[PDB]
Design an enzyme around this catalytic site. Structure first.
Site, PDB file in Angstrom:
ATOM      1  N   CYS C 154       0.822  -1.221   0.000  1.00 56.27           N
ATOM      2  CA  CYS C 154       0.000   0.000   0.000  1.00 56.27           C
ATOM      3  C   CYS C 154       0.865   1.286   0.000  1.00 56.27           C
ATOM      4  CB  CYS C 154      -1.049  -0.043   1.149  1.00 56.27           C
ATOM      5  SG  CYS C 154      -0.340  -0.267   2.843  1.00 56.27           S
ATOM      6  N   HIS C 181       0.638   6.666   9.638  1.00 54.22           N
ATOM      7  CA  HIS C 181      -0.184   5.549   9.156  1.00 54.22           C
ATOM      8  C   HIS C 181      -1.229   5.107  10.182  1.00 54.22           C
ATOM      9  CE1 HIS C 181      -1.018   1.583   7.252  1.00 54.22           C
ATOM     10  NE2 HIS C 181      -0.247   1.930   6.231  1.00 54.22           N
TER      11      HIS C 181
END
Ligand SMILES: [K+]
Ligand SMILES: [K+]
Ligand SMILES: [K+]
Ligand SMILES: [K+]
Lengths: 335, 335, 335, 335
Positions: C154, C181
């Site tokens: 990702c 994140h």
């Protein structure tokens, strides 16, 4: 057509506007003006984007003294004193009073001087209001001569539709409620001065008990139960959606199956579109953006003697926003 | 001095060890050994630092086959089969069984084959256990012949100290509990497969109804109330501390003042050090690291006819941890 | 039409299926089978309802050995050994390998022995994979002879679309990334044993530094930058959406206006539909359910001498999910 | 003894008072008065209990016009206009100005009319202030004739002690900072009007970019670097503790070992007690209630060419609160 103005374009005011447009303008209402002290460009941006309710599916522009929503021109005003607002010139039928500073008929009377015909307060009202309404339960009490009313609270709108069919078919002797409730902007991020010493504490890190008038207020809308209900709230770390947990003493022996059956028949009949009934294993997030006043969670029902517990989910923003529109039509249609 | 070993050094085991040392070794107990399958350096790190309970105020060293805490050498073992553990050679009196895999007497008896004298399970036990104990309420049931017992659950240890004085001094016909409870590691961060379809949903974003047997389990501790209590849990987005909300029908007429008075007297008498009583305007974070089993929040008590609501705060980790030490002493002192 | 099977129906697999149906089946793909060890009724429930991604707008039914989605019957299997799965009999072209247990070509090749033609791993692959792809950046490297590939991670899919135009049109000497994140299910709710001593600590209460190989992995996708990039992650208390913060040394003098101009041109050209460009004052929740690999936040760009900072938003679940479909088509179209 | 008054008993003011008493009154300071518009009983309660900083270990009583802390009588005042406060009669040496409404020498001058000798603003000051100080870095610039100064910001106090030894021993050409920062009470629980369209968005659900003057302000305290640093902040969902992530171009080739070695020697020398140095695998919660201005996390240091990244933890409340006391002594001791 009913011509509406919104006084206060905070969360309650914006959510009423979004509920009108997102539902395809199904009520015969036109929003013709908003009064708010903020920058109209900021208020347009917060209509387009929201954290809890996501992105508005329509269009919003600012053009001079108007905010334009799905092509409709809405006049934008900014004055602290409603006596000075041009409600008469704009031919306003109902002001939806959403600021929290005009919660008595005495104070809401300033909108009447401005030239509006009627006012609905988006909150509990003082003792001097003409009526206090939960739509679906007692909107029949309204008269053509009422001029300032209250739409009650988000919590009273969840609890009253629960209590009415149970008192009618079984009988409620006494009841005590806890609402486990999302935080609101009255609370704080980290501890700071507040009039309520518990709400002065970080909303994101704690369970916070606080007072609620919702259980006592059921006595305003169902006079047969005045004095028979009491309760409190626990604020917890979620942004939206709440649950009423009601414990009551029934007037005769009963069962889980009978109690759930009464609620199910009411959701399919007199209270259709206001009280819903659910049997799936869901959690609070699944009720976000659900327009019902009250949804019974049938799996949670318990009976121990004549002691009964029933629980009902509510989007504490969106249910109430949609009911403000229903109550507007009822008030202007009253004989 | 009672020689103790801990089987399973997860959160429960670490919190028992920390309660023993932070309280100044007040119980006549020495922790002589820990059995766990994880790296001893990782387990030492998680003893020194915790999010919920902060930094351990003492010292922790790894040194060969020992973890050394405030100078005491504790033997570290790693064996899945309790019968193969050297409890006999280390002269262990009591094993605190904290893994969740040995919750019946038939399974936990493996520790006795290993050479230990007694086992206390840190959870509700199977139907074959010798006793189930809430310390302060029924520890007098214990006998010198008992060898494997349960310390009940965190929620049962909050509820039973409330209902005992209320039933004794007033009388309880029927009752229903909701516990509004902090999330645990059985839950999830974002939605994923789970045996319970509600616990499969993000713990950080929702209120999540779930079953608990804690209200029914009061019948094991107080046989006079067997069958008269039931309830459920609502999991909410906090890391630690929970509240019991009990609604019950009293056997006679009463008042808020009488109900609170019964609880205050019990907190100062027979249940001193187990049931506390608070009149300040506090919130859940203020009860983090509080070792009481149950603290009544006196401001929240309500009475409507014979229907009564009482609410009590509990640190769901720390209260239980401290009770495990109390119950150890009671078991070894029983006649 | 490309016939696809999903191995592993955790969050990654469910999000690929949802991206396919919610986007109107825009790719010439049919999902014909899912392999997973969990109860099919639980997996159907978690398809209908999600916290982060809300309610699936279509229909899902279980019916014998099929899950039926918007009317399409999808075969449900449950076998740990890919060589024993009926991929040959179901005429499967591509298996999307999403379990985390088959991340080398030697292990993933078991699907080919089962009868499938190709495998795409939903993660960084071992040193033996035929290719590692960031769609839009290097999918032109693919050949008809390739049989097992990686779709990278990702974070690599956010970073590589930024650095490609910046290196091409300006030049990158050296760079260092921090990704801030959202937490994932590898982390914990309250502190407990973990292989990583920082991830052993509560995800909901702290900023938590952790390693990632995503910056170094850009070298597999853009060999010209091999060895010139490194970085780390900081995990913070959000459920979804992340941001790449890239600091790099440019090969010549430049300005904020030139850097943003290069990125805007790339977003409208070669990287259209993969790299987006935004000038509005938004926050992370606004990017939830946004299918872009990378969205540059133009307001955040800074330049001090030759030192440049660029920041880019990514839905760490949904961008990747949509790219898995893009890469499937590219693999089957390669010459 | 230096006689201090606190203007504004919000979080900054309370934390300065707690830092003085919790540290055993190690500075030769006596707090003789507080001015605040709130109820003194409420302000005493919030001194006894805090969510982030826990319970105050001492005693607090309200007695007439005084708040009594550990036996010391502190005069409680409540006036909006500092020209009317009795600072002269109370013989106040330094007012710690903590309201945010008096951040220029022009405005802070009202305390001078009241009879105080000097003022320290707990925030960045306007261009007209006599000095801007980071204690440990430039407190040597102070003169006996300075009367209104700024203590800079929480972030500038973390970044400057990092930059000084690196510029001295290695040389900094250019630098760009991101601070990943806890939320504050300037932000909101759920979206509502704000002057900053990003801070108008829920702080609990998102990563929120926002401006910071901290990097440019390093030029006020180290004039040799004026114009060479820039950066921004990302607000994330934690209640306290932040991290500076600094990327810079070094004036010559270097290594991880050299960069860490420079910082370690500085923490043991000129900056002892201000800059700390840590090699353990910790997370943000472990730094809560840590009084250092800046703690280097040595494990996070990276070098790629002349491009260097270093990261430092800071309790953004507690570090700054302790430095306000240090700067008070420095200001009154200046020749
Ligand atoms: K507030
Ligand atoms: K779990
Ligand atoms: K985990
Ligand atoms: K605010």
């Amino acid at each position: 057509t009913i011509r509406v103005a919104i006084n206060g374009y905070g969360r309650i005011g914006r959510n009423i506007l979004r509920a009108h447009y997102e539902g395809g303008k199904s009520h015969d209402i036109e929003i013709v003006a908003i009064n708010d002290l903020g920058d109209p460009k900021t208020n347009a941006h917060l209509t387009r984007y929201d954290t809890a309710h996501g992105k508005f599916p329509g269009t919003v522009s600012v053009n001079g003294s108007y905010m334009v929503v799905n092509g409709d021109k809405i006049r934008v005003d900014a004055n602290r004193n409603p006596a000075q607002l041009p409600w008469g010139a704009l031919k306003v039928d109902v002001v939806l009073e959403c600021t929290g500073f005009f919660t008595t008929k005495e104070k809401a009377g300033a909108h009447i001087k401005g030239g509006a015909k009627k006012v609905i307060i988006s909150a509990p009202g003082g003792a001097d209001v003409d009526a206090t309404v939960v739509y679906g339960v007692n909107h029949g009490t309204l008269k053509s001569t009422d001029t300032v009313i209250s739409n009650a609270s988000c919590t009273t709108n969840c609890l009253a539709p629960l209590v009415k069919p149970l008192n009618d078919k079984l009988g409620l002797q006494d009841g005590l409620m806890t609402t486990v409730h999302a935080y609101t902007n009255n609370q704080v991020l980290t501890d700071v001065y507040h009039e309520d010493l518990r709400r002065a504490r970080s909303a994101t890190m704690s369970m916070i008990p606080t007072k609620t008038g919702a259980a006592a207020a059921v006595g305003d809308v169902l006079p047969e139960l005045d004095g028979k209900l009491n309760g409190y709230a626990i604020r917890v770390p979620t942004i939206n959606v709440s649950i009423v947990d009601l414990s009551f003493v029934a007037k005769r022996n009963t069962t889980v199956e009978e109690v759930n059956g009464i609620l199910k028949a009411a959701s399919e009949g007199e209270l259709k579109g206001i009280l819903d009934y659910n049997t799936e294993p869901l959690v609070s997030v699944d009720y976000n953006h659900d327009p019902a006043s009250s949804t019974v969670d049938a799996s949670l029902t318990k009976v121990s003697g004549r002691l009964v517990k029933v629980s009902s989910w509510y989007d504490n923003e969106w249910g109430f926003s949609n009911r403000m529109l229903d109550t507007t039509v009822a008030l202007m249609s009253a004989a």
